[PDB]
Amino acid sequence: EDEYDVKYQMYKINARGENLFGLQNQKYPELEKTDAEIKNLNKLYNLY
Amino acid sequence: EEAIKQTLRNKFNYNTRECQTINPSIRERGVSTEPPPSDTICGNITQWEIFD
CA distance B52 to B46: 10
Q: Which H or E run contains A37?
A: helix A27-47
Query: Distance between alpha carbon B15 and the CA centroid of its chain, in Å?
Result: 38
Q: Which residues contact B52 (CB under 8 A, 6 or more apart)?
A: none
- For residue A31, count other CB atoms closer than 10 A to its CB: 19
- For residue A38, count other CB atoms closer than 10 A to its CB: 19
Q: Could you give the C-alpha distances from A41 to A3, A47, B17, in angstroms and in order?
A: 11, 10, 44
- CA torsion B31-B32-B36-B40 (nearest 10°) is 180
CA distance A38 to A9: 12
A9–chain B Cβ distance below 8 A for any pair:
no
A23/B10 Cβ within 8 A: no
A6–chain B Cβ distance below 8 A for any pair:
no
